């Protein structure tokens, strides 16, 4: 209703290029030593991990550092980290 006001959002990071045997653990060790708040795995329509994992953090730093770990390899596939400007996605 005629809204629109900039407001710092909850920093969020996205991870893609993960195998089928990927879990919250892998993400933790991948994002480590950083420690996120909640690791939400993108479950496609038919429930399937299609190279996509939403991870949130407490302080911006943790996130800013998360980007550092770019062009990495875990599980058995190339991973690409991206900073989600918006932030929240679920709902």
| CB neighbours of residue 41 within 10 Å | 15
Closest CA to 35 of 23, 46, 25, 43: 25
- The residue among 87, 69, 88, 89 whose CA lies nearest residue 79 is 69
**Domain residue limits, the chain:** 9-88
- Return the ∠ at Cα 48 (arms to 11 and 51), rounded to 5°: 50
What distance in Å separates the CA atoms of residue 23 and residue 68, rounded to the nearest whole number?
Answer: 21
How far is the C-alpha of 24 from the C-alpha of 68, rounded, in Å? 20
Q: How far apart are CA 91 and CA 80, in angstroms?
A: 24
How many C-beta neighbours within 10 Å does residue 64 have?
14
- Residue 62 and residue 77: Cα distance in Å, rounded? 24
Asked whether the beta carbons of 39 and 12 are under 8 A apart, the reply is: no
Cα–Cα separations (whole angstroms), residue 73 to 6, 29, 32, 38: 36, 12, 14, 22
Helix (H, G, I), strand (E, B) or coil at 67: helix
Secondary-structure breakdown of the chain: helix, strand, coil percentages, each rounded to the nearest 5: 20, 35, 50
CATH 3.30.420.480 given to domain 9-88: no
């Amino acid at each position: 209703g005629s809204s629109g006001s900039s407001g710092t959002t909850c920093h969020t990071v996205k991870l893609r290029g993960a195998p089928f045997n990927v879990t919250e653990k892998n993400v933790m060790e991948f994002l480590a030593p950083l420690k996120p708040v909640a690791i939400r795995i993108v479950r496609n329509a038919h429930g399937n991990k299609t190279g996509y994992i939403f991870v949130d953090f407490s302080n911006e730093e943790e996130v800013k550092q998360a980007l550092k770990c770019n062009r990495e390899y875990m599980g058995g596939r190339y991973i690409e980290v991206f900073r989600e400007k918006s932030g929240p996605s679920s709902g």
